[PDB]
Amino acid sequence: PLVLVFVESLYSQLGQEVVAILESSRFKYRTEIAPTLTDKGRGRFALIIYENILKYVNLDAWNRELLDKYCVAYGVGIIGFFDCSINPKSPLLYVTRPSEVFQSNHSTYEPVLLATVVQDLGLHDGIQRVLFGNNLNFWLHKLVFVDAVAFLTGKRLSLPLDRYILVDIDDIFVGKEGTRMKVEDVKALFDTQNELRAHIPNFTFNLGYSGKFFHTGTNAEDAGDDLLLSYVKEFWWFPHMWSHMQPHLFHNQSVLAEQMALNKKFAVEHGIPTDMGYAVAPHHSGVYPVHVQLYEAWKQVWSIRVTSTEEYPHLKPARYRRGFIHNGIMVLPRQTCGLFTHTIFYNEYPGGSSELDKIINGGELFLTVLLNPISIFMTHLSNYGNDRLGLYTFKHLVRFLHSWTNLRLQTLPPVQLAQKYFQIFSEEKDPLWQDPCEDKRHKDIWSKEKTCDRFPKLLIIGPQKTGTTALYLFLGMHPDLSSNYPSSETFEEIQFFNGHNYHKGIDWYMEFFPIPSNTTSDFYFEKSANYFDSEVAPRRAAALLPKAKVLTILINPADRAYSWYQHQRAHDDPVALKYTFHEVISSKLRALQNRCLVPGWYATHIERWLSAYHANQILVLDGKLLRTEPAKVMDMVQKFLGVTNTIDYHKTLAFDPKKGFWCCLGKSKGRKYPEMDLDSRAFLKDYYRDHNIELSKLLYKMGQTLPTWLREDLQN
Amino acid sequence: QVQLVESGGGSVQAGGSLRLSCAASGFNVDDYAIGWFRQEREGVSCIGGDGTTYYENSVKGRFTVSSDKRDNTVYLQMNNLRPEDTAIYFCAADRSKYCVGKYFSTPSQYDFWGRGTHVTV
Ligand SMILES: Nc1ncnc2c1ncn2[C@@H]1O[C@H](COP(=O)(O)O)[C@@H](OP(=O)(O)O)[C@H]1O
Ligand SMILES: [Ca+2]
Numbered sequence A: 001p002l003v004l005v006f007v008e009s010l011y012s013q014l015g016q017e018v019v020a021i022l023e024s025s026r027f028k029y030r031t032e033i034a035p036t037l038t039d040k041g042r043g044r045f046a047l048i049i050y051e052n053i054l055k056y057v058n059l060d061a062w063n064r065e066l067l068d069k070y071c072v073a074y075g076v077g078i079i080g081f082f083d084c085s086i087n088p089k090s091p092l093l094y095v096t097r098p099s100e101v102f103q104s105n106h107s108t109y110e111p112v113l114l115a116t117v118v119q120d121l122g123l124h125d126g127i128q129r130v131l132f133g134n135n136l137n138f139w140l141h142k143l144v145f146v147d148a149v150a151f152l153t154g155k156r157l158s159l160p161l162d163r164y165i166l167v168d169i170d171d172i173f174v175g176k177e178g179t180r181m182k183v184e185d186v187k188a189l190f191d192t193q194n195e196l197r198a199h200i201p202n203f204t205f206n207l208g209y210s211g212k213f214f215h216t217g218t219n220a221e222d223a224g225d226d227l228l229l230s231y232v233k234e235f236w237w238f239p240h241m242w243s244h245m246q247p248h249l250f251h252n253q254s255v256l257a258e259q260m261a262l263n264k265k266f267a268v269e270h271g272i273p274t275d276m277g278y279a280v281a282p283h284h285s286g287v288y289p290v291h292v293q294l295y296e297a298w299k300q301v302w303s304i305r306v307t308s309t310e311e312y313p314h315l316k317p318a319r320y321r322r323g324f325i326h327n328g329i330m331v332l333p334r335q336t337c338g339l340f341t342h343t344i345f346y347n348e349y350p351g352g353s354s355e356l357d358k359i360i361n362g363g364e365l366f367l368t369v370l371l372n373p374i375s376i377f378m379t380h381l382s383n384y385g386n387d388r389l390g391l392y393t394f395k396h397l398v399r400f401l402h403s404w405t406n407l408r409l410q411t412l413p414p415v416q417l418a419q420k421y422f423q424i425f426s427e428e429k430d431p432l433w434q435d436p437c438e439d440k441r442h443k444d445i446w447s448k449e450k451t452c453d454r455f456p457k458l459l460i461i462g463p464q465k466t467g468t469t470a471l472y473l474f475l476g477m478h479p480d481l482s483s484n485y486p487s488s489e490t491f492e493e494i495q496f497f498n499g500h501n502y503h504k505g506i507d508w509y510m511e512f513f514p515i516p517s518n519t520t521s522d523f524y525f526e527k528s529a530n531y532f533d534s535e536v537a538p539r540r541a542a543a544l545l546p547k548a549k550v551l552t553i554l555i556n557p558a559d560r561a562y563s564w565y566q567h568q569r570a571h572d573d574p575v576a577l578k579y580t581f582h583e584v585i586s587s588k589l590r591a592l593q594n595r596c597l598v599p600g601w602y603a604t605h606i607e608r609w610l611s612a613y614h615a616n617q618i619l620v621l622d623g624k625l626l627r628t629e630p631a632k633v634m635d636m637v638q639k640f641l642g643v644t645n646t647i648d649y650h651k652t653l654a655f656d657p658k659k660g661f662w663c664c665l666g667k668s669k670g671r672k673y674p675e676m677d678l679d680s681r682a683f684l685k686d687y688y689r690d691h692n693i694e695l696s697k698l699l700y701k702m703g704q705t706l707p708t709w710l711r712e713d714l715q716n
Numbered sequence B: 001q002v003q004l005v006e007s008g009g010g011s012v013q014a015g016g017s018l019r020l021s022c023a024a025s026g027f028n029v030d031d032y033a034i035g036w037f038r039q040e041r042e043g044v045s046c047i048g049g050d051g052t053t054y055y056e057n058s059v060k061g062r063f064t065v066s067s068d069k070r071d072n073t074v075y076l077q078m079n080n081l082r083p084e085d086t087a088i089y090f091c092a093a094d095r096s097k098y099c100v101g102k103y104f105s106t107p108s109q110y111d112f113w114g115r116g117t118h119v120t121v
Helices: A013-024 A061-074 A139-152 A183-199 A219-224 A253-270 A292-301 A353-360 A364-371 A389-404 A414-424 A440-445 A468-476 A537-544 A557-570 A574-578 A587-597 A602-612 A630-640 A678-687 A690-701 A708-715
Strands: A003-006 A029-032 A047-050 A077-079 A118-120 A129-131 A162-172 A206-209 A236-239 A306-309 A324-326 A329-335 A374-379 A408-410 A458-461 A481-483 A523-528 A549-553 A618-621 B003-006 B018-025 B035-038 B042-047 B053-055 B064-068 B073-078 B087-092 B117-119
Touching: A003 A013, A013 A029, A013 A139, A013 A364, A077 A139, A129 A139, A139 A364, A162 A389, A162 A414, A183 A219, A183 A389, A206 A253, A236 A253, A253 A292, A292 A329, A306 A414, A329 A414, A353 A364, A353 A389, A364 A374, A364 A389, A374 A414, A389 A408, A458 A468, A468 A481, A468 A523, A468 A549, A468 A630, A537 A602, A549 A602, A549 A630, A557 A574, A557 A587, A557 A678, A574 A587, A602 A618, A602 A690, A618 A630, A690 A708, B003 B087, B018 B087, B018 B117, B042 B064
Parallel strands: A003 A029, A003 A047, A047 A077, A077 A129, A162 A206, A162 A374, A162 A408, A206 A236, A306 A329, A329 A374, A458 A523, A458 A549, A481 A523, A549 A618
Antiparallel strands: A118 A129, A324 A329, B003 B018, B018 B073, B035 B042, B035 B087, B042 B053, B064 B073, B087 B117
């Protein structure tokens, strides 16, 4: 269900608002200015937004005919963009509840928002239109925009009405004198949780205690918080460290476990239930990027399955904040709530108290609950102690939410919240790793013992049986270049970005490349042969290594498939030995034919790697030239990598007729097999014709010289 | 209480220099982003918590933002002043002190703002 957006400008703010609501809703958008509408009998776009609807009115007439034809044949709706009251009888209303520009006398439209936003009926021209008067600044306009995307795709681009709010009270028992609570604030906190249990079912506050700085303030405040020792059954609690200290500053698992065990002793002596699988780091230190010892010490002494951070994948914008299941702990995005540690009074809020009243009545709070199914809110003790700011913000937030939305607001315990989060978003179960040094806030979150820039600058992708390990060796000969360490059984393959090794993490990948120094070479590389045909490898490789270079070599795909077939014949694999090559071109036969022929389709893999990496970073050679004259092609690689010093490869690469190749790895790269049969060569020349044609057009598109075998296959 | 107070105004009308002082009362100025926004709001400058400095292309050879920890005040030493520069300059605080080049111009990146002061060029 791709959705096509037609922005008026690339820097237009309404395009950022519409794309912002679509990225907050995880709806897969297509950015375009002022194209092909179908993809071989299936619709390419499920919904259209014009950010300027006058583009559609003044459209090209043939293209308008194709647009209206594609809309009526596939049921595609168009969203337009040029006090406020909600229509109770409107079919647009799915999330919006009726509580507290465009004029047509003929009944051909539904006035959903009445002064603004209307829903034109589908029977006028076969297409459905939802038209917007103003932009997406008011919160009711964003509410009816979510309802507009919901109805026009037939609830395909929508979310369920069940909505989930977790409220964390961080910084409990941490403040100095004048910021902590007394008996009045604890009693008002319990009374507020009674009324919010009346509003939201099982709304119980989650409290981030710190046990060291309890019993150290005012004894009147300590007797003021002694009534919270009588109030333990009616409150949820999560550990927020003993001394509110950042977990990456410890950089030892054991002393962090002693701090968490001191908070565990505090939880036992208070009457706190040692349950619920939830805890949050103080400055979110160690959650993204992953400090392994925080994740290990969390589940060791607390059974943490859920944490929540705002650091993934970046701190700002909050629309991009995803969750990820790494190291057995299902991380969730955290939300800011508008409440901070410096806010202790209603009067001393930044921008006045009215700015808080915009944040409650339609700010980051309300669009956070509307656009996210799971919303974990951060509040601090200073918002509960003097003017009771968090009591104010949630007594007004759930009143606003139950007034204007018909959402099923339920507070489950955070294990059920994390299970619901990864049931709704199953694509976010895999983490997407990024560079810790690239964002300096993440580097502050990253531990100081971990050395920066331990990553490759070149990716020698495959495919297999082409000559990639000889190119790996010859790039290893250069003093300015340093090869990767061998990764145990897989050797010079790390197979990080394509397999299950991506779930091991950044620090597993960083161990193969040592610490940069004056003695060690700066430029680093790995040969990664399975990353060619893999679909998951280029996007993750562009995520972690944005400025890396891509080096592919390509030989004749009939001979590549033949050498791959003889490679599994020489590895004594039973299906490839059992059937001859004519039968190849059971499930093992189909798997062998798929990994023998889909690696031969060079264009479909170079499209993925070119969608990830820039074509300046991608360079393609001949491969047979690596067997005939390798010094000129190695001079071309040395010009490609941008190195300063240059090795004269004419004199150090010596031809060996005893091996048949310029030197080498001996028997494994010097195999001698009988030549391909003539009927098999006719079948494999006939099938590798169209793949060679789009391959030749692709290599002319890339600004690359075409190989020899491609030119004789194009001529014959 | 986080408060941002700014000052500085006028110019030599064909082009001159100023040092707009944004005082950060109630919090530390080396812990936040303190990016300057001119009027919608355009983020022409940003000064990171380690001192890392970003500009737009109109202001890249001209403006010089700076920071001083001692009076807790971020300064904007302006130079070679074009008539397009006249606006309301907003020193805005952000929890991420370090600036990123995609988002140091966005007003949605910056949480707590200032009163704003006018430069007339
Ligand atoms: N200089 C060189 N040294 C060794 N093998 C080379 C080579 N140039 C090309 N090759 C080829 O590289 C192929 C293996 O490619 P890869 O690097 O992906 O393992 C070998 O096919 P064979 O193993 O069938 O003899 C061999 O023919
Ligand atoms: Ca805290």
